[PDB]
Amino acid sequence: SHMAVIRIADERDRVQKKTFTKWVNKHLIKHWRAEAQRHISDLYEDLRDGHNLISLLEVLSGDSLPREKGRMRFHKLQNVQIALDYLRHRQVKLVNIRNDDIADGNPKLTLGLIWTIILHFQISDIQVSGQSEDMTAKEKLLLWSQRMVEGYQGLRCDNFTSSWRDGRLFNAIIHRHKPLLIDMNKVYRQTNLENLDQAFSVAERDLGVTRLLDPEDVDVPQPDEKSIITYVSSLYDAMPRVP
């Protein structure tokens, strides 16, 4: 039923919005200016005037950016363009996004923009042995993921969706780095949620990785790709060495 597919597609979007919202908040709070340490309530509303966008880029780059102090739409578009122009200076190719779209809270383009920023700042230097230079950041992260669970019995990482549903990969990657923290023998028998909860809990408590995903989000036949990548990438950053 087409109704089933839309249901799943809408669900993946719900998860992506929740994920990017947590990711943005994670960084915004690290901003040096107290009043810039804002909290996003609705990703489709709190980036519209451009201020949080500028703050996000400042925190991620350490670079200082100007801000319009007016309230006219003209000021908002300009505020948004400051952020968009910085990304271009950074040689980031902007996909299909206009000032107007961000100023009007365009859902898809807003998520698209946050995705672009995540990709550029968090998934820009993955290094993995066996790496082939032509590979994209996404392809590199997938190889790193595969390289990481290499020596584990019967578990493959064919992608950034279904492959991560049962929590097995998440636990193996943690174990690979801190075996004394994960009982791999037990992760094979227990439920998907059980594995997901454990992984996210250990990652946070012992590796200091923010819990971007809820086990309930990932235990679906096709988890949201970008949500998975985003979190997996933050797992990579918690790793001290390169496989």
Curated annotation (Swiss-Prot):
Gene name linked to the record: PLEC
Entry's localization field: Cytoplasm, Cytoskeleton; Cell junction, Hemidesmosome; Cell projection, Podosome
Disease the record associates with this protein: Epidermolysis bullosa simplex 5C, with pyloric atresia: A form of epidermolysis bullosa, a genodermatosis characterized by recurrent blistering, fragility of the skin and mucosal epithelia, and erosions caused by minor mechanical trauma. EBS5C is an autosomal recessive disorder characterized by severe skin blistering at birth and congenital pyloric atresia. Death usually occurs in infancy. Epidermolysis bullosa simplex 5B, with muscular dystrophy: A form of epidermolysis bullosa, a genodermatosis characterized by recurrent blistering, fragility of the skin and mucosal epithelia, and erosions caused by minor mechanical trauma. EBS5B is an autosomal recessive disorder characterized by progressive muscular dystrophy associated with generalized skin blistering.
Chain residue ranges for the region called Actin-binding: 11-240
Family membership noted in the UniProt record: Belongs to the plakin or cytolinker family.
Domains: entry comment: The N-terminus interacts with actin, the C-terminus with vimentin, desmin, GFAP, cytokeratins, lamin B; whereas both the N- and the C-terminus can bind integrin beta-4.
Domain Calponin-homology (CH): 14-122, 135-240
Function: Interlinks intermediate filaments with microtubules and microfilaments and anchors intermediate filaments to desmosomes or hemidesmosomes. Could also bind muscle proteins such as actin to membrane complexes in muscle. May be involved not only in the filaments network, but also in the regulation of their dynamics. Structural component of muscle. Isoform 9 plays a major role in the maintenance of myofiber integrity.
Protein name: Plectin
Subunit and partners: Homodimer or homotetramer. Interacts (via actin-binding domain) with SYNE3. Interacts (via calponin-homology (CH) 1 domain) with VIM (via rod region). Interacts (via N-terminus) with DST isoform 2 (via N-terminus). Interacts with FER. Interacts with TOR1A. Interacts with ANK3. Identified in complexes that contain VIM, EZR, AHNAK, BFSP1, BFSP2, ANK2, PLEC, PRX and spectrin. Interacts with COL17A1.
PTM per Swiss-Prot/TrEMBL: Phosphorylated by CDK1; regulates dissociation from intermediate filaments during mitosis.
Reported tissue expression: Widely expressed with highest levels in muscle, heart, placenta and spinal cord.
Shown chain mapped onto the complete sequence: 176 to 403 of 4684
Organism per entry: Homo sapiens
